[PDB]
RNA sequence: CUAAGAAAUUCACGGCGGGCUUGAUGUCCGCGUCUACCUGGUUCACUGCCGUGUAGGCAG
């Protein structure tokens, strides 16, 4: 038959904004007085982060919730959909739960991929992962400086257990909280460079930062086997895969290898990909959005 | 198809003896709805003026088309039980994407 | 130079081509004032005068030690993720020059230059400089951060004429020709 | 009849002081046969020299304002005049009443001859243009461009050459420059069936006629029948009630060397569709054919749906 | 070669004097707008410069 008239996903893998602060380095036990980044007007009106002389690197604070139950979608029109999208999900977990996935996610959480031009020419990009359940740390982590990579993704002795914990997170037995932070040393009076509104830059209050959906498209990039060719790196997830940087759309739709239509007979035709592009579909369904007509 | 004519005539004839058509004051929604009854190039005009100044698609214009034919006509729940409605669904529907094809080229 | 280093764009899933390009075009701007010397020029082999595109290839010239010594460099720091290498190997080919080509493309700096120049008025300004004084170009251009002044602006690039054969001369600080000619291969 | 090979358009075109009777039975716009005429006008002067021939015409009425009057709360009109000069004494003896109208009209002219065969595309539309400017097209003056944002814009549309979708976008792009007018076709399968229709008691071309353009309100045993078009009553030719004649027979002829007849014109039903509403420009193209066998020398256009 | 071809509506003028529109009023009851998103088009095909002239090197 059809698929429904009206459905949406929620999103999870919940990301806040990304507080800058400047600090010095070996200061990154004691990021609790870094004076955050203030933005002023000087005059052609320019807006330049000019971090202070007693401060050359930037740590970018933010916050990250993933909360599971991917499968449930929000409001969905036909009642014999929301069960055989039910069914799919749970044998995609039962066959093979979303490990791969985890590890990819937590490579993203790796290499700062949510900084986009204060990560360029960097000397080392430390994030410093915590894990708060309580209101105290449970197991924090340290990550290092040649395993950020932008591409490399392997079994790390310590990255493991953050797949783990992003995976116990996201399958719907109690949701984790992680304070990551990212020190990166940048340069002296160098302009870190955040989101910018309609120059008029993106600033919380007494700071500047960077919008949540840029966090969460760059914490997103786990597509990798797309038609086209799988050689510069991978791309963040997307329906349509578009990509406007690159400046290209891809999965064009004369292909069938788009989430519109693989889902379409997944769950009706039961056509059931490989292993990738099911691990596709499923975290394009951790992105949410609105699907159907 | 008389009121859809009419309704082009309209348009050709209110955007053709009126080159007022700027930034002034109360002329706000006159250029992301108004691009069909719009003005020609100003003269302060930027480079990339084919979005902020004239935009090239009937962008608003298409809905607005939708919701006139929703609203001169109140169809309801039943209105569907033969071919009879929802055949004139089906052409203003068509007439709808015919006056947006034409209206697309109308900023070139 | 007799050595050239090619220093190929791997394409970005995060930024364009011109993107990386501008950033590893400043970091050669900050490796050559850090160096110093005028025997540096850059060339670009995938150049399209049709699209007005540079293409994904930064190829240098100068002699092997400098190529040496700005591989051990950390002006390459952060960027050996994002780039692709070769070998410093010897050049096989005519020659042409590598240009900056400034525009006086807005009258309003030329308007205040007469007024601060020549104590005028706006208005005797405006009639001097009017607004046909700006010229466009259908060059190529690389996107960088400013030093006195704070604005993002584009360095337009000329790839000369092709001449046989080669004259002495020096190279800028961006590896452009200051009198010095570069060899197209 | 023949297709033409190109659509040489005339732009918008200010004529004043035209003739707005046109026709015993009608005020209104102009006579379709006056356009006819002022096409083969101009092809007797400039198509000879250009090599060319100009068979039809668009007639799409941008703008009209008739010379009218509606005189102290009364349904009809009247015509406003014009002061003749004096006899040989001061009588203001005879006043003939006849009706002037403002019309901006823009024509559309099929081209047979040797228009890209050994000519340019331009330089003909550019001669034409500025030699249609030095006459008059339905009784009055053809008023030049003196006004601001200087047009010229004399298309010389090639048809039969280029690809289908090519040629569909020509015709569409021709149709931008068509904007606020209203093209005029003539309807005599309409007017037939519709005296089929009511043939009930006697069918009389004339009461159909006389019964159509109306609005013929009628009750229920409360509303007004449903506007079917613009329908308007035009002249469609003349119709001859005297036999031919030699030139130099017929006293006080307009010249001696072609022959006479004495012709009443025939009543035609016309309508005022918009220039979207058509599939190609060149459907809707004003010829006239004659049938010297009877006395019928008919105007209309042929294939005009 | 067009219901073709042709055409001066002119001169003058006191609208004007008056006036009570008014009385009264129950708008009522009730509600799920949801989910997602890189502004890094150039918020000016820039900006003060060695000579009033284009010839430039210090966060350029």
Redesign the pocket.
Same mark, same amino acid.
């Given at each position: 038959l059809s698929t429904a008239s009206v459905l949406?996903?929620?999103?999870k893998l919940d990301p806040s904004d990304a507080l800058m602060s400047a600090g010095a380095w070996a200061q990154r036990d004691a990021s609790q007085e870094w004076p955050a980044v203030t933005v002023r007007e000087k005059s052609?009106?320019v807006d330049?982060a @000019?971090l202070p002389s007693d401060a050359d690197t930037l740590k970018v604070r933010f916050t990250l919730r993933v909360l599971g139950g991917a499968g449930t979608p /929000?409001?969905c029109n036909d009642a014999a959909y929301r069960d055989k999208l039910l069914q799919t999900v749970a044998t995609y977990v039962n066959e093979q739960g979303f490990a791969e996935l985890a590890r990819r996610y937590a490579h993203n959480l790796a290499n700062a991929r949510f900084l986009?031009?204060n990560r360029?020419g960097a000397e080392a990009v430390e994030v410093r992962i915590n894990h708060i359940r309580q209101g105290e740390v449970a197991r924090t982590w340290r990550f290092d400086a040649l395993a950020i990579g932008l591409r490399d993704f392997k079994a790390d002795a310590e990255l493991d257990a953050l797949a783990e914990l992003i995976a116990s997170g996201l399958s719907g037995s109690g949701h984790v909280l992680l304070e990551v932070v990212a020190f990166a040393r940048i340069g002296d009076?160098?302009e870190v460079?955040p /989101?910018? %509104?309609?120059?008029?830059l993106?600033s919380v209050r007494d700071a500047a930062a960077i919008?949540?959906?840029?966090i969460? @498209?760059?914490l997103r990039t786990i597509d990798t086997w797309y038609p086209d060719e799988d050689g510069l790196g991978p791309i963040?997830v %997307?329906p349509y895969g578009s990509?406007? /940087?690159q400046g290209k759309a891809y999965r064009q739709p004369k292909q069938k290898l788009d989430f519109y239509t693989l889902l379409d007979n997944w769950v009706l035709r039961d056509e059931a990909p490989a292993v990738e592009q099911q691990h596709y579909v499923i975290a394009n369904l951790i992105?949410?959005?609105?699907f159907g007509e | 198809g008389q009121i859809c004519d009419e309704a082009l005539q309209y348009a050709a004839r209110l955007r053709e003896l009126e080159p007022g058509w700027s930034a002034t004051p109360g002329c706000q929604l006159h250029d992301a709805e108004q691009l069909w009854l719009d003005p020609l190039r100003a003269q302060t005009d930027?480079?990339?003026?084919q979005?902020?100044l004239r935009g090239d698609w009937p962008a608003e214009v298409g809905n607005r088309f939708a919701n006139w034919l929703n609203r001169a006509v109140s169809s309801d729940s039943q209105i569907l039980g033969s071919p009879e409605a929802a055949q004139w669904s089906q052409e203003l529907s068509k007439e709808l994407t015919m006056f947006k094809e034409i209206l697309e080229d109308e900023r070139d | 130079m007799d050595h050239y280093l090619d220093i190929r764009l791997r394409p970005d899933? $995060?930024?364009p081509p011109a993107?990386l390009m501008?950033?590893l075009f400043?970091k050669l701007?900050?490796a050559l004032?850090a160096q110093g010397g005028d025997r540096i020029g850059v060339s670009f082999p995938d150049l399209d005068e049709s699209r007005s595109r540079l293409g994904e290839r930064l190829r240098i010239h100068a002699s092997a030690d400098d190529l040496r010594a700005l591989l051990a460099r950390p002006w390459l720091e952060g960027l050996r993720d994002h780039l692709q290498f070769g070998e410093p190997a010897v050049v096989p080919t005519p020659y042409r020059q590598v240009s900056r080509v400034?525009?006086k493309?807005?009258p $309003?700096?030329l308007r205040?230059?007469?007024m601060?120049?020549?104590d005028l008025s706006e208005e005797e300004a405006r009639k001097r400089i009017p607004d046909t004084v700006?010229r466009?170009?259908?060059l190529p251009?690389v996107?960088?951060?400013?030093?006195? *002044?704070?604005?993002?602006?584009?360095?337009?690039i000329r790839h000369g004429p092709l001449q046989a054969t080669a004259e002495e001369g020096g190279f *800028?600080?961006?590896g452009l020709s200051?009198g010095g000619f570069v060899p197209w291969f | 009849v023949t297709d033409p090979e190109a659509l040489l358009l005339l732009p918008r075109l200010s004529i004043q002081n035209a003739?707005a009777?046109?026709?015993?039975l009608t005020w209104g716009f102009?006579?379709p046969?006056? #356009?006819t005429? #002022?096409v083969?006008?101009?092809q007797?002067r400039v198509g000879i020299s250009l090599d060319i021939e100009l068979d039809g015409v668009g007639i799409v009425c941008h703008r009209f304002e008739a010379q009218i009057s509606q005189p102290a709360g009364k349904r009809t009109k009247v015509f406003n005049?014009?002061?003749?000069?004096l006899n040989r004494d001061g009588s203001t003896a005879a006043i003939?009443e006849?009706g002037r109208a403002h019309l901006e009209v823009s024509l559309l002219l099929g081209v047979h001859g040797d228009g890209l065969d050994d000519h340019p595309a331009q330089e003909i539309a550019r001669q034409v243009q500025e030699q249609a400017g030095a006459?008059?097209?339905? =009784? =009055?003056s053809i008023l030049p461009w003196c006004n601001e944002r200087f047009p010229a814009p004399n298309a010389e549309l090639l048809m039969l050459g280029g690809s289908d979708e090519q040629r569909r976008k020509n015709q569409r792009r021709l149709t931008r420059r068509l904007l606020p007018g209203f093209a005029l076709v003539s309807r005599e399968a309409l007017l037939q069936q519709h005296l089929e229709t009511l043939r009930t008691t006697l069918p009389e071309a004339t009461t159909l006629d006389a019964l159509l353009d109306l609005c013929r309100i009628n009750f229920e045993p409360w509303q007004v029948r449903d506007k079917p078009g613009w329908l308007v009553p035009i002249?469609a030719g003349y119709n001859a009630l005297s036999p031919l004649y030699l030139p130099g027979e017929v006293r006080n002829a307009?010249?001696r060397?072609?022959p006479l007849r004495f012709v009443?014109?025939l009543f035609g039903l016309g309508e005022w569709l918009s220039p979207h509403r058509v599939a190609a420009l060149s459907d809707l193209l004003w010829y006239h054919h004659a049938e010297p066998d009877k006395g019928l020398y008919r105007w209309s256009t042929p294939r005009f749906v």
């Open positions: 949406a996903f929620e999103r052609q009106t330049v @000019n /929000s409001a986009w031009r360029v009076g160098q460079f /989101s910018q %509104e309609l120059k008029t993106y919008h949540s959906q840029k969460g @498209n760059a963040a %997307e990509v406007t /940087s992105r949410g959005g609105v | 930027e480079t990339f003026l979005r902020r | 899933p $995060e930024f993107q501008s950033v400043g701007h900050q004032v400034q525009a493309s807005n $309003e700096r205040r230059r007469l601060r120049r020549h700006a466009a170009l259908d251009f996107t960088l951060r400013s030093q006195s *002044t704070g604005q993002h602006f584009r360095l337009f *800028t600080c961006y200051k | 003739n009777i046109s026709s015993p102009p006579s046969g006056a #356009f005429g #002022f083969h006008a101009l007797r005049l014009t002061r003749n000069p003939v006849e006459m008059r097209l339905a =009784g =009055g002249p307009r010249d060397e072609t009443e014109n």
